[PDB]
């Protein structure tokens, strides 16, 4: 609820593999909450992409971000550095769900990881080999 | 002098070599009046870098009344390595332009001794001016 779509892109959509889940595309415009509820009583630029699906529910990923979201703000108030990302879900009907999805995602069945690594930032004589190698760490 | 230190390997024993030829073959280079400050001037900027938050960001580094950068490794034992290695060419050709022409280098060491830039931080470490000092009663 932090944001407005602004416009609905149309031949975007796509259906995921699991069971038909979709995918829906907008262009949405980061504004707030109370301004927000103005707008839409009345009627930062980015492309959000969500995934509903129909016939499970997964109110223990909501537990599991609740868990997520407090480690992330003991960690934020203490002062470390450790990365974790909390997307955003919600149960809206029996068995039916709305996911936030993460653009731009490599996961390891698609690519040795080590060699690839090594291909793209050369040996250790370069920083942005280290710079990989510490957020991998964190 | 600048490149005698590169983050590669060949580059600087190359370097290094050229160095020995050019002031081998040109005496009167080692009793200069330009060429020791920029020396100084290195060595306070790298012992300078030395001791910095190793986790901090921009390795990189400026050295004054001169257009040129300098970039670091990562890790703390070679930077004290570098700086290490660094810290001996400095002495052996002090030593070596003393053991010729004393009164004018000594008049050039008295002469830098007096910059006013340098007393405000003078009350930090400067390893510049100790160098000098040292060297000259050494």
Redesign the interface.
């Known amino acids: 609820p932090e944001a407005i779509v602004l416009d609905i892109d149309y031949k975007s959509g796509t259906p995921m593999q699991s069971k038909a889940p979709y995918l829906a595309k907008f262009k949405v415009k980061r504004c707030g909450v109370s301004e927000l509820e103005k707008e839409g009583l009345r009627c930062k630029i980015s492309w959000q992409a969500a995934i509903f699906k129909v016939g499970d529910d997964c109110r223990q990923d909501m537990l599991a971000l609740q868990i997520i979201d407090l480690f992330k703000n003991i960690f934020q108030l203490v002062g470390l550095d450790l990365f974790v990302f909390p997307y955003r879900v919600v149960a809206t009907a029996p068995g039916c769900g709305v996911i936030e999805c993460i653009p731009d995602c490599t996961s390891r069945d698609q690519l040795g990881m080590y060699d690839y690594f090594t291909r793209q930032y050369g040996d250790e004589s370069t920083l942005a080999f280290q710079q990989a190698r510490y957020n991998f760490i964190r | 002098l600048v490149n005698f230190n590169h983050?590669?390997k060949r580059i600087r024993r190359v370097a290094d070599k050229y160095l020995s030829g050019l002031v081998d073959k040109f005496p009167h280079l080692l009793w200069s009046g330009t060429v020791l400050k920029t020396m100084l001037d290195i060595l306070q900027t790298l012992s300078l870098s030395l001791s910095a938050d190793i986790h901090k960001d921009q390795?990189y580094y400026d050295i004054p009344d001169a257009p040129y950068r300098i970039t670091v490794p990562?890790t703390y034992e070679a930077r004290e390595s570098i700086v290490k290695d660094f810290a001996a060419r400095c002495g052996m050709i002090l030593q070596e332009a003393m053991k010729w022409a004393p009164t004018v280098t000594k008049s050039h060491l008295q002469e830098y001794l007096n910059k006013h830039q340098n007393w405000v931080s003078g009350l930090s470490q400067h390893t510049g001016l100790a160098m000098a000092t040292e060297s000259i009663l050494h």
Do not use: E
Request: charged share 25%; no cysteine.
């Open positions: 983050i590669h390795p990562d």
